[PDB]
Design a protein around this ligand. Structure first.
Ligand SMILES: *[C@@H]1O[C@H](CO)[C@@H](O[C@@H]2O[C@H](CO)[C@@H](O[C@@H]3O[C@H](CO[C@H]4O[C@H](CO[C@H]5O[C@H](CO)[C@@H](O)[C@H](O)[C@@H]5O[C@H]5O[C@H](CO)[C@@H](O)[C@H](O)[C@@H]5O)[C@@H](O)[C@H](O[C@H]5O[C@H](CO)[C@@H](O)[C@H](O)[C@@H]5O[C@H]5O[C@H](CO)[C@@H](O)[C@H](O)[C@@H]5O)[C@@H]4O)[C@@H](O)[C@H](O[C@H]4O[C@H](CO)[C@@H](O)[C@H](O)[C@@H]4O)[C@@H]3O)[C@H](O)[C@H]2NC(C)=O)[C@H](O)[C@H]1NC(C)=O
Ligand SMILES: *[C@@H]1O[C@H](CO)[C@@H](O[C@@H]2O[C@H](CO)[C@@H](O[C@@H]3O[C@H](CO[C@H]4O[C@H](CO)[C@@H](O)[C@H](O)[C@@H]4O)[C@@H](O)[C@H](O[C@H]4O[C@H](CO)[C@@H](O)[C@H](O)[C@@H]4O)[C@@H]3O)[C@H](O)[C@H]2NC(C)=O)[C@H](O)[C@H]1NC(C)=O
Ligand SMILES: *[C@@H]1O[C@H](CO)[C@@H](O[C@@H]2O[C@H](CO)[C@@H](O[C@@H]3O[C@H](CO)[C@@H](O)[C@H](O[C@H]4O[C@H](CO)[C@@H](O)[C@H](O)[C@@H]4O)[C@@H]3O)[C@H](O)[C@H]2NC(C)=O)[C@H](O)[C@H]1NC(C)=O
Ligand SMILES: *[C@@H]1O[C@H](CO)[C@@H](O[C@@H]2O[C@H](CO)[C@@H](O)[C@H](O)[C@H]2NC(C)=O)[C@H](O)[C@H]1NC(C)=O
Ligand SMILES: *[C@@H]1O[C@H](CO)[C@@H](O[C@@H]2O[C@H](CO)[C@@H](O)[C@H](O)[C@H]2NC(C)=O)[C@H](O)[C@H]1NC(C)=O
Ligand SMILES: *[C@@H]1O[C@H](CO)[C@@H](O)[C@H](O)[C@H]1NC(C)=O
Ligand SMILES: *[C@@H]1O[C@H](CO)[C@@H](O)[C@H](O)[C@H]1NC(C)=O
Ligand SMILES: *[C@@H]1O[C@H](CO)[C@@H](O)[C@H](O)[C@H]1NC(C)=O
Length: 394
């Protein structure tokens, strides 16, 4: 019965893997900074939440190649974002948001450790730059031209003048994956054996932290059980995470197990100590330093409103109001199929900010992990895809 779900050009699992039937949505949430100058002079930051802005993902797998014997498959996954205005607050082309000036914050990082050179820091003093900027929502995620980057682009053309959170992530696959089909065992269904041609991460300080575990997270192995733990590799998150069983749900007419991301994942603990790039020093519970993943930028990952995290971070930034129900990330999956009936996946992007004497752009600013944006990656099972799926046996 389990044999029905494998990835091979005959099965229905494949056609639904190749072109996933269910629509998937990402909603974007920005924190609009209230007191920019007051922040620079050392006062507590205060933000206002702005969102969502709704984009429907267009998902198909490409460059599908076939296994050693029958046991492996490899491909890339192209996701594109199609904006839905009526499910969003406004038109992100018009709508404005004020936050940290991120492009300059990285080159400043690039000043202190030299990923490009210090002393071309000159461009910073030649052209006045602000640590807080205003750009349309469309601009921050889909890209805009920065004036510092534009100059630096002249001396070294490899660096792009364009900054964006999601810049050039429309329509493109991340990474080359090779995947384990269900032939050796169902348990290995859509497991990640290797990514980008390397089967491990080189980013993290220990052997265990650097492992690539489990599925990409958009599917699971059939015949799931309440006791076990499901590993997931979120490429964009720069590491692998697992989920623990929470409660029993009924989506549609069908059973589901609710798995959640346990607070342990981003917490400060001796198992997690490798996620500190300096070793013996990491920032604390509930935040991760994802810098090496992103071009040397001082970018911190956290859950929305710093949920599942030390509350000293929550205190530092006004307007952070973490609650479980909204900011948790959960997966409701069908025990038999392992198919995902409903889920919501939520990460937050933070930027590390501190006063530097070498740069007056930073003023007297407090040392803190500063919220820019978080997102809900969500999926719900349609009511006629429910019953065709509920048509089993056979
Ligand atoms: C989130 O996560 C991020 C990563 O994911 C974190 O990012 C990390 O942040 C830490 C913060 O501490 C940072 O560590 C620092 O690194 C500094 C940079 O190190 C490199 O550069 C220096 C200096 O470059 C200059 O080197 C000499 C001159 O000093 C010259 O010969 C060089 O060519 C170059 O000079 C050139 O430029 C000038 C112009 O400026 C020209 O005029 C000149 O002609 C030259 O062209 C180097 O010394 C370093 O070398 C080390 O590392 C390489 C790696 O390959 C080794 O090969 C090398 O042997 C050496 O290794 C060891 O020596 C250093 C000696 O400083 C020791 O620190 C250590 O034992 C090394 O293992 C690098 O090439 C660095 O300067 C700084 O250290 C300073 O402060 C400490 C304070 O204790 C002092 O003791 C030192 O003496 C230094 O003054 C510190 O180590 C990481 O680099 C950074 N990593 C990444 C990947 O980003 C981020 O922090 C995190 N965020 C949060 C919030 O947690
Ligand atoms: C993707 O992720 C985002 C963010 O997590 C979700 O957006 C949230 O959606 C939830 C519902 O799924 C919203 O929750 C509702 O908020 C309403 C507004 O509450 C305000 O008003 C009350 C007092 O009236 C204040 O106390 C509060 O602080 C707010 O200022 C509530 O009225 C709703 O309450 C109803 O449901 C709850 C359920 O617990 C009951 O307790 C209530 O009695 C009542 O029945 C509810 O709390 C939330 O506001 C949304 N937030 C944002 C930022 O948009 C998306 O839903 C999620 N999924 C998708 C598909 O987008
Ligand atoms: C996030 O916070 C920032 C900072 O508070 C905020 O940016 C500001 O938005 C307001 C609009 O909400 C901008 O004010 C407008 O500026 C233009 C250009 O000068 C004017 O034409 C506008 O005047 C009209 O405004 C009303 C109608 O729109 C009328 O009452 C009025 O008579 C005029 O017709 C208006 O003054 C302001 O320029 C920006 N400020 C900065 C620094 O960007 C942003 O809107 C916030 N985002 C969200 C989603 O709330
Ligand atoms: C991301 O790329 C996709 C793919 O082109 C865009 O989706 C299309 O957008 C056009 C509007 O220019 C419309 O025809 C539809 O919304 C999409 N086309 C089809 C055939 O579905 C999407 O607009 C792009 N988004 C951004 C932010 O660049
Ligand atoms: C990847 O998976 C391996 C095992 O599947 C994890 O290693 C285990 O970590 C736990 C920590 O509680 C230890 O008790 C086990 O002894 C470890 N097992 C093995 C075989 O090493 C590893 O931590 C996972 N890493 C990531 C990043 O998900
Ligand atoms: C699956 O369907 C037929 C089988 O020959 C073929 O036209 C198609 O290219 C196959 N696809 C893959 C990825 O093998
Ligand atoms: C696939 O087969 C079984 C199922 O878990 C296991 O013993 C084996 O190690 C799996 N292969 C890989 C590469 O994980
Ligand atoms: C992280 O944990 C270790 C051991 O539990 C502790 O020594 C260190 O102070 C902690 N740091 C933070 C920021 O919580």
């Amino acid at each position: 019965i389990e044999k029905k779900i494998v990835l091979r050009n005959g099965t229905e699992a494949f056609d639904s893997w190749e072109k996933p039937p269910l629509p998937v949505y990402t909603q974007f949430y920005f924190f609009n900074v209230t007191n920019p100058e007051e922040i620079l002079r050392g006062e507590t930051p205060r933000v206002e939440e702005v969102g969502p802005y709704t984009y429907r993902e267009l998902r198909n797998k490409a460059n599908i190649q076939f296994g050693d014997n029958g046991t492996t498959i490899s491909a890339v996954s192209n996701k594109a974002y199609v904006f839905e205005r009526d499910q969003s607050v406004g038109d992100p082309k018009i709508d404005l948001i004020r936050t940290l000036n991120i492009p300059v914050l990285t080159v400043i990082e690039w000043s202190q450790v030299h990923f490009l050179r210090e002393i071309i820091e000159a461009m910073l003093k030649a052209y006045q730059q602000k640590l807080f900027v205003t750009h349309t929502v469309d601009e921050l995620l889909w890209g805009y031209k920065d004036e510092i980057l534009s100059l630096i682009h002249v001396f070294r053309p490899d660096i792009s003048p364009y900054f964006g959170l999601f810049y050039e992530k429309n329509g493109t696959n991340d990474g080359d994956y090779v995947f384990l089909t269900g032939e050796d065992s169902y348990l290995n269904f859509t497991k990640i054996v290797e990514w980008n041609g390397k089967t491990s991460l080189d980013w993290w300080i220990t052997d265990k932290c650097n492992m690539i575990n489990g599925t990409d997270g958009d599917s699971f192995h059939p015949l799931i059980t309440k006791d076990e733990v499901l590993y997931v590799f979120p490429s964009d998150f720069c590491r692998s995470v697992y989920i623990t069983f929470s409660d029993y749900e009924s989506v549609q007419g069908l059973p589901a197990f609710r798995y959640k991301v346990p607070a342990e994942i981003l917490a400060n603990t001796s198992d997690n100590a490798g996620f500190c790039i300096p070793e013996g020093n990491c920032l604390g519970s509930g935040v991760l330093n994802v810098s090496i993943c992103k071009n040397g930028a001082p970018i911190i990952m956290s859950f929305p409103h710093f949920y599942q995290a030390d509350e000293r971070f929550v205190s530092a930034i006004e307007g952070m109001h973490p609650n479980q129900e909204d900011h948790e990330t959960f997966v409701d999956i069908n025990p038999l199929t392992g198919i995902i009936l409903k889920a919501a996946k939520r990460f937050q992007i933070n930027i590390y900010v501190k006063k530097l004497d070498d740069f007056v752009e930073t003023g007297d600013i407090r040392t803190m992990v500063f919220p820019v944006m978080y997102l809900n990656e969500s999926v719900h099972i349609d009511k006629e895809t429910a019953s065709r799926l509920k048509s089993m046996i056979n």
